[PDB]
Design an enzyme around this catalytic site. Structure first.
Site, PDB file in Angstrom:
ATOM      1  CG  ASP B  92       7.194 -16.994  12.031  1.00  0.00           C
ATOM      2  OD1 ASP B  92       8.138 -17.794  12.200  1.00  0.00           O
ATOM      3  OD2 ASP B  92       7.095 -15.938  12.674  1.00  0.00           O
ATOM      4  CG  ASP B 263       7.924 -10.118   8.460  1.00  0.00           C
ATOM      5  OD1 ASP B 263       8.867 -10.874   8.746  1.00  0.00           O
ATOM      6  OD2 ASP B 263       7.227  -9.553   9.333  1.00  0.00           O
ATOM      7  CB  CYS B 293       2.801   6.805  -4.632  1.00  0.00           C
ATOM      8  SG  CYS B 293       2.129   5.156  -4.486  1.00  0.00           S
ATOM      9  CB  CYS B 295      -0.201   2.641  -5.701  1.00  0.00           C
ATOM     10  SG  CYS B 295      -1.276   3.655  -4.640  1.00  0.00           S
ATOM     11  CB  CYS B 298      -1.236   7.741  -5.536  1.00  0.00           C
ATOM     12  SG  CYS B 298      -0.877   7.499  -3.780  1.00  0.00           S
ATOM     13  CG  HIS B 324      -0.473   4.575  -0.481  1.00  0.00           C
ATOM     14  ND1 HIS B 324       0.126   5.237  -1.533  1.00  0.00           N
ATOM     15  CD2 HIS B 324       0.236   4.904   0.624  1.00  0.00           C
ATOM     16  CE1 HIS B 324       1.133   5.957  -1.077  1.00  0.00           C
ATOM     17  NE2 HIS B 324       1.224   5.772   0.230  1.00  0.00           N
TER      18      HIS B 324
HETATM   19 ZN   LIG Z   1       0.008   5.368  -3.626  1.00  0.00          ZN
END
Ligand SMILES: [Zn+2]
Ligand SMILES: Nc1nc2cc3[nH]c(NCCN4CCOCC4)nc3cc2c(=O)[nH]1
Ligand SMILES: Nc1nc2cc3[nH]c(NCCN4CCOCC4)nc3cc2c(=O)[nH]1
Ligand SMILES: [Zn+2]
Lengths: 358, 358
Positions: B92, B263, B293, B295, B298, B324
């Site tokens: 930016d 963003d 999820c 990720c 998780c 996460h």
């Molecule tokens: Zn997750």
């Protein structure tokens, strides 16, 4: 693997190197145990802790009983499951932390965090609820300095509490069959009291013996002096654990004196001594924290970057500094283990100090 | 790869999916760009940022010029080298952050952090020194609410500054040949001003066009209303970037309106809406933050554990929550990209809102 087996593979003077086998894994000794106060090794995933070379981490009866609670952790499946570390965990008994962070009696100690109780029986129970692998006896950490009378009274109470710890541990079948129990030597800086304490603990019988009551402001010279006569009083065929930081030079000297296990909670360790990364002279230093270190932090980021992160209060700064520092400690333990195995540890100690203090 | 190539692979209504090719990598659109304020994506290693699926991250001219300094980062090899992220970075221009975190004139803005200056020329120079891949024009972010007169005056100044940004960028050969330049549309909530702004920017010519002046307190209904007529004013064959959070429901609706890039800086996102992990009801919840999820957080840790970490102020809590949340955003962008490619995005949007707001 067995519940507990300590094997000594090689010796040089008072120094030993070997292995502790337990159900959750093998611990290479001399060992450094990163400290995981509130069910976390600060700013590190367990996978990262393991990657630095740690075989075991430390937890604390006192901190965990306050938050999140011992009963709670048991309900959630135990500390290993809760925090995601599946290798051995040693837990301190609360003997130290209650006093540093209250009403004492022969039965135990009651304190305010919210009021709470600790006794030999409750401390062993909490360590059971946590599912700890190496359980520490519940003791009284003698303040320094202490008069001979006070040191003696405290040591004697701790030895009575060591017996209660032993019996509480043994009366709980799942714990006695799967975990180990270490006794803690007290006696302040007094040789005769340390001898009485060692005799008491050996008569009771433990899987390992810690040297307690040190790293409490007495200074390295005094600590080394006390270790000089205290460690040989302990059973030779069991691990010896010095409680408390635990700086790199402390570790080297303590291994020279027969200690097998260690813990320690902007400062970055290097083979040329510690640096404070906050110092302005690192603001444009493109070199890694240490020139030889093989940790991931030193492979990737500069002193300049980490200087910036720490100054700015960025969390990544803490993550990187911590990973490097714990990895440095593990690399030190590896050099110690290798040098003892090869009969060149006394030389390594001399070389280490020449450079670290240059 | 080329300096810059935007290709649209598929469309559904106003929504597009495709790719931006740049020298440092390919960006899949619609894209979510994690924000890395002080040369770090908070509490995450770059390797972890990449693992969540991020193709590009955002940095800020304002924050970096204050600490560690733009000239300093250039001397140290540029932002990519400094922080260890080798893929595209969008920066930016400072147009927003100076005002939120001072003396204005047609030349630019002077402010106190320690006094500093920003102009179109200095902002483009700083982005060059940082080595940014997508350079934002230097603008004035119109406060909300704004009168039509004030919005017009501000928009007109921003358009004059857009021309100065363009010329400063073009006059610097290494920058013009290796980076891209995006213009920023202003005009507040007024259709005629947004039209004038779009016409000005298109006449100057940019690699991409951002919708500025939103996510400033106007609320989602107003933002969507303004996006309804503003985005079609922009050149169709260039990326469209909505500046500012950027919550998951904002993203879905904005993609429905033709935006390609996004963003956003105890709250955990789930497909059933956000939760606050600090809430007591999670203290013994063994389930992961979200049930679907994929990720790493998780896969490994419970709500109960993360609840404990956040409550205790532990750094690992921030690390896990952030990984996460950014991974959730990337999984959302993937579902959007897939659904547009398969012509079922309007259905996905409906399904998403039904569940997220249930
Ligand atoms: Zn997750
Ligand atoms: N249970 C127990 N824990 C201790 C922990 C210590 N930490 C330090 N140094 C810091 N010194 C320590 C001493 C003890 C001790 O004597 N007993
Ligand atoms: N240069 C520039 N940056 C912006 C950043 C923004 N962030 C938000 N929302 C938070 N809204 C934003 C608007 C702008 C803008 O109009 N110009
Ligand atoms: Zn290192």
């Amino acid at each position: 693997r067995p519940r507990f087996s300590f094997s000594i593979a090689a010796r040089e003077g008072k120094a030993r190197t070997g292995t502790i086998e337990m159900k959750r894994g093998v611990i290479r000794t001399p060992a450094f145990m990163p400290v995981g106060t509130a069910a976390t090794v600060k700013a590190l995933k367990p996978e990262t802790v393991r990657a630095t070379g740690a075989d075991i981490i430390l937890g604390n009866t006192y901190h965990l009983m306050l938050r999140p609670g011992a009963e709670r952790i048991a309900k959630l499946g135990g500390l290993h499951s809760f925090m995601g570390w599946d290798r051995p965990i040693l837990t301190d008994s609360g003997g130290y932390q209650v006093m540093s962070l209250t009403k004492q009696s022969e039965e135990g100690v009651t304190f305010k965090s919210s009021r709470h109780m600790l006794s030999p029986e409750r401390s062993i129970e909490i360590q059971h609820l946590l599912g700890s692998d190496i359980v520490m006896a519940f003791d009284e950490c003698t303040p320094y300095p202490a008069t001979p009378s006070r040191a003696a009274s405290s040591m004697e109470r701790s030895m009575r509490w060591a017996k209660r710890s032993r019996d509480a541990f043994d009366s709980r079948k799942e714990q006695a069959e799967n975990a180990a129990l270490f006794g803690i030597q007290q006696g302040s800086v007094f040789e005769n009291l340390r001898q009485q304490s060692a005799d008491a603990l050996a008569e009771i019988g433990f899987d390992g013996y810690a040297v307690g009551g040190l790293a409490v402001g007495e200074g390295q010279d005094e600590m080394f002096r006390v270790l000089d006569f205290s460690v040989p009083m302990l059973p030779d065929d069991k691990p010896h654990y010095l409680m408390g930081c635990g700086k790199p030079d402390d570790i080297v000297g303590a291994v020279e004196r027969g200690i097998d296990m260690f813990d320690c909670v902007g400062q970055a360790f290097t083979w040329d001594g510690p640096i404070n990364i906050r110092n302005a002279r690192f603001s444009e230093d493109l070199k890694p924290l240490d020139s030889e270190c093989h940790c991931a932090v030193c492979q990737k980021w500069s002193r300049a970057y980490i200087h910036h992160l720490i100054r700015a209060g960025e969390i990544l700064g803490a993550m990187l500094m911590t990973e490097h520092n714990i990895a440095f400690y593990q690399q030190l333990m590896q050099k110690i283990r290798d040098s003892i195995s090869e009969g060149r540890f006394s030389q390594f100690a001399q070389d280490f100090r020449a450079r670290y203090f240059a």
